[PDB]
Amino acid sequence: MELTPDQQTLLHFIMDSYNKQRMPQEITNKILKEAFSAEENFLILTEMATNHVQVLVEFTKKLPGFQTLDHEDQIALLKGSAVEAMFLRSAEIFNKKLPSGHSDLLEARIRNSGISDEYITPMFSFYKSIGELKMTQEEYALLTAIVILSPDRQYIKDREAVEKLQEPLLDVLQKLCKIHQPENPQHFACLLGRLTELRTFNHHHAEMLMSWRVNDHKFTPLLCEIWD
Amino acid sequence: HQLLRYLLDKD
Numbered sequence: 550m551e552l553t554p555d556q557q558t559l560l561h562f563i564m565d566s567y568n569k570q571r572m573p574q575e576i577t578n579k580i581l582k583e584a585f586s587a588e589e590n591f592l593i594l595t596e597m598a599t600n601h602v603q604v605l606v607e608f609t610k611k612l613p614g615f616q617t618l619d620h621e622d623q624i625a626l627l628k629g630s631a632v633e634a635m636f637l638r639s640a641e642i643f644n645k646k647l648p649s650g651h652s653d654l655l656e657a658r659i660r661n662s663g664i665s666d667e668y669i670t671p672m673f674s675f676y677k678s679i680g681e682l683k684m685t686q687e688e689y690a691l692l693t694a695i696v697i698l699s700p701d702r703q704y705i706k707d708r709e710a711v712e713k714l715q716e717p718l719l720d721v722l723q724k725l726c727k728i729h730q731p732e733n734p735q736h737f738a739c740l741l742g743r744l745t746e747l748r749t750f751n752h753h754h755a756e757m758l759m760s761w762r763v764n765d766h767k768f769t770p771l772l773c774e775i776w777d
Numbered sequence: 778h779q780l781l782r783y784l785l786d787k788d
C-alpha cells in the first residue's frame with residue numbers, strides 16, 4: 550500500500566542519480582546532420598556507445614551500498630552488467646528521450662551502418678516489447694539498478710554482499726507495481742520478462758563484435774576491448 | 778579491464 554520511509558529513501562537515491570543521466574545534445578544533433586553513409590552512421594553509434602559506458606559507471610557508483618563492496622567485485626559487476634544496462638538505456642533513449650523525427654533517423658542510421666540483420670532485428674524487437682509496458686521513469690531506474698547489482702556475474706568474490714544490495718531494490722519494484730497497478734497483478738512478472746530478454750543480448754553482442762574484422766571501419770578497440 | 782577501472786576510480 551505504501552513504501553516504508555527506508556524504501557522511500559532508497560528510491561529517492563536511485564531516482565536522483567538516474568535523472569542526472571543525460572545523452573548530450575552534441576551527440577543527438579549529429580543524427581540530423583552527418584552524411585548518411587555506413588562510416589558516418591557507425592561513428593554516431595560509437596559516440597552513443599561511449600556516452601552509454603560513461604553514464605553506466607556514474608550511475609553505478611552512486612547506487613546505495615555499491616561503494617561498500619570489495620573493489621574487485623565493483624569492477625566484476627560493471628564488466629558483467631555493461632551490455633544489459635547499455636541495451637536497457639538505449640531502449641529508453643529510442644522510445645522516450647528522442648523526438649519521433651530523431652528516433653526515425655536514428656533507426657535509419659542503425660539499419661545502414663553495415664551491421665547484420667541478425668543483430669539489428671532482436672534490438673528493435675526488444676525496443677517494441679519494452680515499449681508495450683509503458684514503463685515509468687521509476688521502473689526504468691529500478692530495473693537498471695537490478696541489472697547492475699546482479700549477484701551471478703562472473704568473478705564476484707562476495708555474492709551475498711551483492712544479494713543484500715539487489716534484494717531491497719526488487720522489493721521496492723514489486724511494491725511500486727502493487728501501488729500503481731493494483732488491478733494488474735501480472736505487472737511485476739512482465740518487468741521480469743525484460744530482465745531475461747536483456748540477458749539474451751550478452752551472446753548477441755559478443756557475436757556481433759567478433760563478426761567485425763580488424764581492418765573493417767566497425768572495429769573500435771576502445772569499446773571492443775571492454776569484452777576482449 | 779583498463780577503461781572501466783579508470784572511470785570507476787576517478788572522481
Ligand SMILES: Cc1cccc(C)c1Nc1c(-c2c(F)cccc2F)nc2cccc(C)n12
Nearest residue numbers: 591594595597598601635636639659769772773
Ligand atoms: C548505440 C548503438 C546502437 C545500435 C547498435 C550499435 C552497435 C550501437 N553502438 C554500440 C553498442 C551498443 C550500444 F551502445 C547500446 C545498445 C546496443 C549496442 F550494441 N555496443 C557497441 C560496441 C562497439 C561499437 C559500437 C558502435 N557499439
